[PDB]
From a paper:
The Picornaviridae family of single-stranded, positive-sense, non-enveloped RNA viruses includes several pathogens of concern such as enterovirus-D68 (EV68). The 3C protease cleaves eight sites within the viral polyprotein, with a preference for a glutamine–glycine (QG) motif at the P1/P1′ positions, a preference distinct from host cysteine proteases. Among strains of EV68, the amino acid sequences of 3C protease and its cleavage sites are highly conserved. We have determined and analyzed three high-resolution inhibitor-bound crystal structures of EV68-3C protease, which revealed possible sites of resistance mutations, a key structural water molecule conserved during ligand binding, and the conformational flexibility of the catalytic histidine H40.
Rupintrivir demonstrated the highest potency with the IC50 value in the single-digit nanomolar range, followed closely by AG7404. Within the active site, rupintrivir and AG7404 exhibited identical hydrogen bonds from P4 to P1′, with one additional hydrogen bond formed between AG7404 and C147 backbone nitrogen. At P2, AG7404 lacked the fluorinated phenylalanine ring of rupintrivir and was unable to pi-stack on the catalytic His40. In this structure, we observed the catalytic His40 in an alternative conformation, where the side chain was rotated furthest away from the substrate-bound position. Between the S2 and S3 pocket, AG7404 contains an aromatic ring incorporated into the peptidomimetic backbone structure that protrudes outside of the substrate envelope. In this region, the mutation of Gly128 into a larger amino acid has the potential to interfere with inhibitor binding and confer resistance. As AG7404 is an analog of rupintrivir, this compound shares many structural similarities and protrudes in the same regions, highlighted at the S4 pocket, where the isoxazole ring forms the same hydrogen bond contact with Asn165. At the S4 pocket, the mutation of Asn165 into a larger residue could preclude binding of the inhibitors, while other mutations could remove the potential for hydrogen bond formation, potentially decreasing inhibitor binding.
Numbering used by the authors: 1 to 182, 184 to 188
Amino acid sequence: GPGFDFAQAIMKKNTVVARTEKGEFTMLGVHDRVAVIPTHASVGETIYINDVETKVLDACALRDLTDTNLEITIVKLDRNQKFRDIRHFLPRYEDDYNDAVLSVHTSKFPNMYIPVGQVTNYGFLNLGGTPTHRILMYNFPTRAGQCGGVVTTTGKVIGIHVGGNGAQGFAAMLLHSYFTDTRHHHH
Ligand SMILES: *[C@@H](CC(=O)OCC)[C@H](C[C@@H]1CCNC1=O)NC(=O)[C@H](CC#C)n1cccc(NC(=O)c2cc(C)on2)c1=O
Ligand code: NA
Ligand code: NA
Ligand code: NA
Ligand code: NA
Ligand code: NA
Ligand code: NA
Ligand code: NA
Ligand code: NA
Ligand code: NA
Ligand code: NA
């Protein structure tokens, strides 16, 4: 069976509704006041979290050493609540996965779970014309409004949903080394 119980506990405590100029996205909180959102959401200086306008204190659009989009943007928010630290649920390496759950938390869909089946390390994807790397694939007709959706197996948060074409769906990997504590001018 899919890990429905695990997906639920991640959604209860570590998701919020994020709204940018592009619209609403499920947003996974990872630790403290640090969360993720698809890069194509176009995060700016402020963002709405659960319909509350919130200062975006930092935003890092991840790219790899080939200078290629990874479709993950990490944000640091000015909010009073800390997110439960779930970094230990993150995969250390790239991997293929069995029988995963995709979970959405938006205004339209406050609590919804989609078993997407097997998830394979896809690698390169031309995402809406942007070369992208480190992509996970599932053969499932995901749909508009599900970007940012959290992809889990039991015990692991493996990525967030970033696109699809009516036949397959795609998530950007989440790796533990993206959120370890570490001087670097990054803007
Ligand atoms: C999520 C965006 C969203 O939720 O926005 C909230 C405001 C959707 C999810 C897609 C739509 C249909 N099925 C899905 O899983 N993302 C998109 O529509 C993305 C966003 C980006 C970038 N998008 C835009 C343009 C093209 C595509 N798809 C492809 O390029 C593609 C290539 C292959 C193979 O499969 N898809 C896309 O996902
Ligand atoms: Na909107
Ligand atoms: Na950051
Ligand atoms: Na680790
Ligand atoms: Na509504
Ligand atoms: Na192919
Ligand atoms: Na396109
Ligand atoms: Na929609
Ligand atoms: Na296909
Ligand atoms: Na750490
Ligand atoms: Na850590």
